[PDB]
Every structure is written in C-alpha cells, then in structure tokens.
Amino acid sequence: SKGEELFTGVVPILVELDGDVNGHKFSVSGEGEGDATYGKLTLKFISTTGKLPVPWPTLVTTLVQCFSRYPDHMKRHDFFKSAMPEGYVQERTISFKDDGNYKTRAEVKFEGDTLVNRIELKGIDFKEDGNILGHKLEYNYNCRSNVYITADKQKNGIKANFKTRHNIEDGSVQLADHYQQNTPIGDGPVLLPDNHYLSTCSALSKDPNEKRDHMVLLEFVTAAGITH
Numbered sequence: 523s524k525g526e527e528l529f530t531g532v533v534p535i536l537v538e539l540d541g542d543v544n545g546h547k548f549s550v551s552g553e554g555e556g557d558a559t560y561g562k563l564t565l566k567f568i569s570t571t572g573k574l575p576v577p578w579p580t581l582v583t584t585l586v587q588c589f590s591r592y593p594d595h596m597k598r599h600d601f602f603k604s605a606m607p608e609g610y611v612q613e614r615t616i617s618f619k620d621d622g623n624y625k626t627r628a629e630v631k632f633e634g635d636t637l638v639n640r641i642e643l644k645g646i647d648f649k650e651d652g653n654i655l656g657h658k659l660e661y662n663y664n665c666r667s668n669v670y671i672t673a674d675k676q677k678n679g680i681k682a683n684f685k686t687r688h689n690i691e692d693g694s695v696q697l698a699d700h701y702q703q704n705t706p707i708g709d710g711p712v713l714l715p716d717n718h719y720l721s722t723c724s725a726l727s728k729d730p731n732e733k734r735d736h737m738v739l740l741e742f743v744t745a746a747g748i749t750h
C-alpha cells in the first residue's frame with residue numbers, strides 16, 4: 523500500500539485519552555516513537571487530571587497497531603498502515619470478568635509527520651472493591667497476547683478478538699475479553715486481510731526521576747499466522 527511507505531523509519535507518536543470510569547474522570551497524555559521495521563514501540567504516559575481510578579495495566583491495550591511488524595510475505599494483509607495517512611477509527615468493548623466494561627472510541631491518524639491516537643474511554647458497572655477500582659492489580663504484563671484479526675468487508679475494515687490476563691496481587695488473574703472494530707477514515711483503497719494474528723509482548727516500567735503518576739511501555743508486535 524501507499525500508506526506502508528510512511529512507516530519505513532522511526533515515527534513520533536502522541537497519545538491523548540479522556541476517561542470516565544464509574545463517574546471518575548481522568549486524562550492521559552503519551553509521547554514516544556514507533557519503528558514498524560522492528561515492530562517496536564516506546565511510549566511514556568502521564569496522568570494529567572483527576573487521580574487515576576483504574577490500574578495502569580488495564581489501559582495498555584487502549585493507549586497504534588499500525589506499528590506492527592508485518593513480514594514481507596504478509597504485507598498485503600496490513601489494514602492498519604494502508605488506511606494512513608487519513609487514518610482509522612478503532613472501537614472496543616473490553617469486558618473484565620466478574621466486573622465492569624470499558625467502551626473505547628479512538629481515531630488514529632497522521633498530524634503532519636506525527637502518528638496520533640486520540641481516545642475517549644467510558645467505563646461502567648465496576649465493583650467498588652473489585653480488582654479494578656480497588657487497585658489490586660500488579661504493575662506488570664503477561665506475554666504474549668494474540669490479537670486475532672478478520673476482515674469486515676461491509677464496513678471496509680477489520681474486526682479483532684483477544685484475551686489479556688492481568689496479575690492480581692494475591693497471585694490470581696483478572697481476565698479482560700476484548701472485541702475490536704476498525705474502519706477507515708479516508709476514501710483511498712485499504713487492504714482487507716486474510717485471517718491472521720498479531721503476537722504482542724508488552725513490558726511496563728517506571729521512570730525513577732518522575733514524580734507524576736505515569737507508565738513507561740516497551741512493546742514488540744509481529745504479525746503471524748500465515749506461512750510464506
């Protein structure tokens with residue numbers, strides 16, 4: 523695709539999220555860069571308004587799959603880059619087992635040379651002393667996640683499903699079921715993929731000199747499931 527050519531080098535990234543979970547309002551700003559040649563993302567996020575009412579790890583999937591490494595033989599299946607620079611809408615429902623749900627709507631597009639992810643997140647039906655509002659999740663991430671992608675010809679886009687599992691401080695796990703839909707913003711042709719998945723590994727850390735509430739993310743993502 524034409525859009526693929528925008529990703530051959532390192533690209534700056536900005537992320538801006540506005541959130542409301544059970545009436546608790548918050549905002550997150552992120553900066554970093556992506557290098558799709560290596561499927562590599564480095565991002566630092568800061569919580570900028572009200573006290574973060576949910577654990578950082580539960581926001582990782584919401585806070586730019588255009589930076590996935592698609593192997594050369596799978597390039598014709600990369601919807602995400604093909605929609606650029608005009609971008610795509612990405613919507614999810616994230617269902618936390620035995621707890622509430624996030625509904626997210628994001629637009630991912632270029633603003634000049636910079637790849638931007640603007641997100642609205644709404645969370646409802648969370649339990650007061652559940653794992654999420656109770657802040658009972660460890661600050662870490664389990665690898666790898668498989669993001670299963672299929673074409674949605676009717677909306678000229680894609681759908682995806684996947685499960686993530688967040689470690690609870692007692693040694694148990696909190697399941698998050700994700701359902702995802704992406705549709706192009708522009709009028710150029712986009713690539714409609716054969717079934718495949720993104721193999722993703724995230725690692726969370728803290729900046730020792732940062733006193734604001736924050737998250738540092740290093741992430742590697744590679745498309746797979748189709749043989750050459």
Ligand SMILES: [Mg+2]
Binds near residue numbers: 551
């Ligand atoms: Mg700012």
Ligand SMILES: [Mg+2]
């Ligand atoms: Mg109600």
